[PDB]
């Protein structure tokens, strides 16, 4: 059988699968900075003096 | 459903346009005048009405629920 | 107002000032007395404030006062509670006659018929003189003297001012 | 003087609870009354001295 | 015990009595109604057995937590609660079954409040986009409400009721929402820039309607029902045996938080039955005369819900009014207990009575401030003339405060001399003194008047008011010497009175290493301190700024100047504490999800039981204990700003008295 702090753990494996996995996750939002990125708009223009 | 969905679009678009052009030319007349129950209240209420309606609309479209552009 | 309650001789002057007519008219005369006489019962001065709302024929407000501060005292053996007594004693020779006619107050003036009888048996219960106590609250109607009675008084109470 | 016995006692903890949650609420309430009425007091004392201060300033001129 | 008809001394009976029968066909079908009326009073029974095994295995299956109540299933819970509150709203009830539904609708209802107080209900049910599910969620929650109101409607049942009252004061406990977040101030930002307001009514017009239906859908609950409800109410709050009185008086406290929504209708019925004299009356007459020593513990419990009911009532403007159009204040000080000095052997009992009564007067004081912002706009004759309180009422308030404060002198003097001969000071000594400095801040403005008014008459009264004003003033002064220059060993000396106290004085305070128990302690301490000053301030400056009695003597007997100034320091470096410390708590706000463990210890400080709680529990914990302590500490850094600006106030005012005091010497 579980213990409390097996089923305890276990939910923890799931809350931090979730946080990586869901749409507005840590891997969505690592593809729009890439896609900004791709796309020029992060590149700002380089006055010179 | 699909023709209802495109009738209530381009209703909206319409609305929004005139919206667009009404709000023009109430802005150069509400500079060029001050500088030498009300039905006022019915056009305000309209207003604020038909923008904060239009962005409930989209927020009710955008914010799993496949995004109506995947469907 | 605040010249007339400071002044050591209110009610003479505030009597006074019903002379002066081509400089105060009759309605800020009026209103100078109604604001004197609410700035006497602001002073605890209960007795000033009614001979002020006498003095403009207002008996509602002299009944009201009057059973206000004579209900908290009633029991009391204070000197306020005898000399707010008297000053009542005199309300009734002198005034009752006024006092007996209002729309208004008609229950409030009942009550201060009643309430000068309850200061008469409290005067006697506080003196010892408990068979003439007796009758002074037999002749209030307030009570049931027998079982016969009990629903009536039972029902009669509930047509009482809330000073009683 | 004075399963389902320990549920008596459950059910009265619950109820004792629930009586004290509202008298430490209205209490909680009362403190952030008296403490906004200083507040309001002060600042309201305050401006009085304000509008007297100019009273006073104009006079010497 | 259960009856049963004894079929066979019927039988036996009708075939003695067979004369009556034209033959035994007859008898023998009158013997299979008894037979039948038996079968059914033994399902009877048997469907009673069900529900006391049923109600019994439930209200442990919660009552031990056994169950986790993260995973405690609100749609099926509300979908129970839902179903049972109908048969507890049955007039065909056993007494027995709907009792054991009421305590079972009970616990049900306190294990929902056990996870609202842990983790935020409904998460499931915003992860749906769905306004259909929230609106199915209210329509239960709802359909709940309207059905423990039918139980109270209906009921004869004291215990009943008494229970139905418990689970109302629980489901508005529930249907609270939780306090929104502070909103900051950028105090610099004072020029010219345009375009900013106008975007700012949409998002209100959103979060105020969207708290607004849930409390407009109570609202519009009561707002059918109140002339029955708060009468049933109104006369179980007096008509109960003891318990259940102070849970009928608890549910009229929880629903005249709400009434703002109905529009005080329930504090203006209540007046519209006599309930408020005729509570005030039942109190002093039963609490406060000369048996207060004798009063029993049971019912100690009654005065302090009725003294809680009457401190409801002056939390609003309608309430302080009609607690003034009931003679409060003078029909609390003609009674015998406020005549009476304490001494060592009852001192407890007289607090646990007196401090009800200053919470009440004080709170009396607090409403007469809003009289200032009449700008002109005539248009419309909506003739509701609500008492906007006037010139007369402040006074009239602190007419009865200063004659009753000046009458009681000698038990007041011994309250402001804080001469505790108790060889430690406690923390309940401290509630009682923190209310009598504030009555006599607010009252002040009178002390200087009664003691100045020199009228050309009895010379003997005038000399008495200023011996009086006299014995008050050195007292008040010399507790603000005590509470300033001893504050930090007050601090160390102070002990906890109750559990309560005692589980402050274990824990922690995050923002400073201190106990809550001596932070408790030290903002009552600020709070002495703060409306001392503001009796000071009013004592110092006159009106037309005049100077009125010195509070700090020349120098650098009344204690001098020396005071004020180290005052002012200490509060000049307890406001840019606080402001560290408030830097602190919106740091931790912006990174709740993100602390250490060692972090989320030292906040949430739930001894061996902390390893059991799970993340977004701790999270939402939290998250909600760091909102509190920036209000606490927002709180605490306006009353020490104005403390410096009182300080500031008074060192001028002193030192501008002096050197013109001096300057009149040479002319």
């Given at each position: 059988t579980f213990t409390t702090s097996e089923e305890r753990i276990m939910k923890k494996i799931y809350e931090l699968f979730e946080e990586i996995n869901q749409p507005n996750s840590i891997k969505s939002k690592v593809e729009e900075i890439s896609n900004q990125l791709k796309l020029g708009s992060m590149e700002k223009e380089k006055i010179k003096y | 459903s699909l023709k209802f969905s495109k009738s209530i679009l381009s209703t909206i678009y319409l609305s929004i346009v005139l919206k667009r052009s009404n709000k023009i030319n109430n802005n150069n007349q509400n500079n060029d005048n001050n500088n030498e129950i009300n039905d006022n209240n019915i056009e305000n209420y309209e207003n604020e009405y038909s923008n904060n309606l239009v962005e409930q609309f989209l927020t009710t479209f955008?914010?799993?629920?496949?995004?109506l552009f995947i469907v | 107002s605040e010249l007339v309650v400071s002044s050591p001789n209110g009610f003479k002057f505030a009597h006074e000032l019903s002379l002066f007519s081509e400089f105060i008219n009759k309605q800020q005369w009026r209103t100078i007395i109604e604001q004197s006489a609410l700035e006497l019962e602001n002073k605890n001065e209960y007795q000033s404030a009614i001979e002020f709302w006498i003095m403009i024929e207002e008996y509602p407000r002299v009944l009201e006062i009057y059973n206000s501060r004579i209900s908290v005292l009633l029991t009391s053996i204070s000197s306020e509670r005898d000399q707010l007594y008297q000053f009542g004693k005199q309300l009734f020779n002198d005034y009752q006659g006024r006092l007996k006619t209002?729309?208004?107050?008609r229950t409030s003036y009942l009550a201060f018929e009643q309430l000068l009888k309850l200061c008469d048996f409290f005067d006697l219960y506080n003196k010892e003189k408990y068979q003439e106590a007796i009758q002074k609250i037999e002749n209030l109607?307030?009570?049931?003297?027998?079982?016969?009675?009990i629903d009536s008084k039972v029902q009669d109470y509930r047509f009482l001012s809330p000073h009683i | 003087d004075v399963i389902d016995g320990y549920l008596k006692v459950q059910f009265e903890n619950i109820i004792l609870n629930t009586i004290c949650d509202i008298q430490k609420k209205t209490s909680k309430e009362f403190q952030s009354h008296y403490e906004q009425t200083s507040i309001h007091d002060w600042n309201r004392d305050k401006k009085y001295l304000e509008e007297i201060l100019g009273q006073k300033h104009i006079k010497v001129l | 015990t259960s009856q049963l008809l004894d079929i066979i001394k019927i039988r036996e009976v009708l075939k003695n009595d067979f004369?009556?029968?034209?033959?035994?066909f007859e008898i023998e079908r009158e013997l299979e109604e008894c037979c039948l009326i038996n079968s059914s009073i033994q399902l009877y029974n048997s469907k009673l057995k069900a529900l006391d095994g049923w109600k019994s295995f439930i209200n442990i299956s919660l009552a031990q937590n056994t169950i986790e109540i993260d995973t405690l299933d609100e749609s099926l819970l509300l979908s129970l609660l839902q179903r049972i509150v109908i048969d507890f709203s049955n007039?065909?009830?056993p007494i027995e079954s709907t009792l054991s539904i009421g305590y079972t609708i009970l616990t049900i209802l306190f294990t929902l409040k056990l996870k609202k107080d842990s983790y935020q209900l409904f998460i499931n049910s915003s992860l749906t986009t769905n306004s259909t599910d929230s609106n199915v969620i209210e329509q239960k929650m709802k359909s709940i409400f309207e059905g423990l109101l039918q139980t109270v409607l209906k009921s004869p049942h004291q215990a009943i009721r008494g229970i139905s009252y418990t689970c109302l004061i629980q489901y508005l406990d529930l249907s609270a929402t939780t306090p929104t977040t502070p909103s900051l101030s950028?105090?610099?930002?004072?020029?010219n820039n345009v375009?900013?307001?106008?975007?700012?009514?949409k998002n209100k017009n959103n979060q105020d309607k969207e708290q607004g239906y849930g409390n407009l859908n109570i609202g519009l609950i009561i707002s059918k029902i109140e002339d029955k409800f708060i009468r049933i109410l109104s006369s179980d709050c007096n008509s109960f045996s003891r318990g259940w009185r102070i849970t009928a008086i608890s549910c009229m406290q929880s629903i005249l938080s709400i009434d703002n929504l109905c529009g005080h209708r329930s504090l203006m019925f209540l007046q519209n039955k006599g309930f408020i004299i005729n509570m005030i009356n039942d109190t002093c007459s039963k609490?406060?005369?000369?048996?207060?020593?004798?009063?029993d513990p049971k019912d100690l419990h009654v005065y302090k819900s009725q003294m809680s009911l009457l401190l409801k009532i002056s939390q609003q403007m309608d309430g302080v009014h009609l607690l003034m159009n009931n003679n409060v204040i003078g029909s609390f000080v003609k009674?015998?207990?406020?005549n009476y000095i304490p001494t060592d052997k009852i001192f407890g009992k007289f607090i646990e009575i007196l401090l009800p009564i200053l919470q009440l007067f004080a709170s009396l004081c607090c409403y007469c401030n809003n009289t200032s912002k009449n700008n002109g706009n005539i248009n419309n004759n909506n003739n509701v003339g609500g008492t906007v309180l006037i010139g007369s009422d402040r006074n009239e308030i602190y007419q009865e405060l200063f004659d009753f404060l000046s009458n009681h002198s000698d038990l007041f003097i011994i309250i402001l001399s804080?001469?505790?001969?108790?060889s430690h000071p406690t923390l309940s000594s401290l509630k009682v003194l923190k209310l009598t400095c504030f009555l006599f801040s607010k009252v002040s403005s009178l002390f200087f008047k009664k003691s100045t008014?020199?009228?050309?008459?009895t010379s003997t009264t005038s000399s008495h008011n200023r011996t009086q004003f006299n014995r008050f003033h050195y007292c008040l002064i010399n507790l603000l010497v005590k509470y300033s220059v001893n504050s930090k060993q007050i601090i160390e000396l102070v002990k906890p009175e109750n559990i309560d106290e005692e589980l402050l004085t274990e824990k922690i305070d995050?923002?400073?290493?201190?106990?809550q128990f001596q932070i408790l302690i030290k903002e009552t301490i600020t709070s002495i301190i703060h409306d001392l000053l503001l009796y000071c301030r009013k004592v110092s400056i006159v009106q037309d700024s005049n100077f009125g009695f010195?509070?700090?003597?020349?120098?650098?007997?009344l204690p001098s100047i020396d005071l004020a100034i180290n005052i002012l320091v200490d509060n000049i470096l307890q406001y840019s504490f606080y402001k560290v410390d408030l830097s602190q708590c919106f740091k931790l706000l912006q990174s709740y999800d993100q602390l250490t463990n060692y972090q989320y210890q030292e906040i949430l400080?739930?001894?061996?039981?902390?390893?059991?709680?799970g993340p977004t529990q701790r999270n939402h914990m939290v998250e909600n204990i760091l909102k509190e302590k920036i209000i606490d500490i927002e709180t605490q850094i306006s009353i020490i700003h104005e403390n410096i600006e009182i300080l500031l106030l008074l060192i001028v005012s002193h030192s501008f008295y002096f050197c013109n005091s001096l300057y009149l010497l040479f002319q």
């Open positions: - | 955008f914010i799993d629920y496949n995004n | 209002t729309s208004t107050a109607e307030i009570l049931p003297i027998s079982e016969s009675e | - | 004369n009556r029968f034209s033959n035994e007039e065909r009830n950028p105090l610099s930002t004072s020029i375009v900013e307001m106008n975007n700012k009514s609490y406060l005369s000369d048996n207060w020593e004798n009063i009674s015998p207990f406020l804080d001469q505790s001969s108790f008014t020199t009228s050309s008459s995050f923002s400073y290493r201190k106990n010195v509070c700090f003597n020349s120098n650098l007997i400080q739930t001894g061996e039981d902390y390893p059991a709680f």
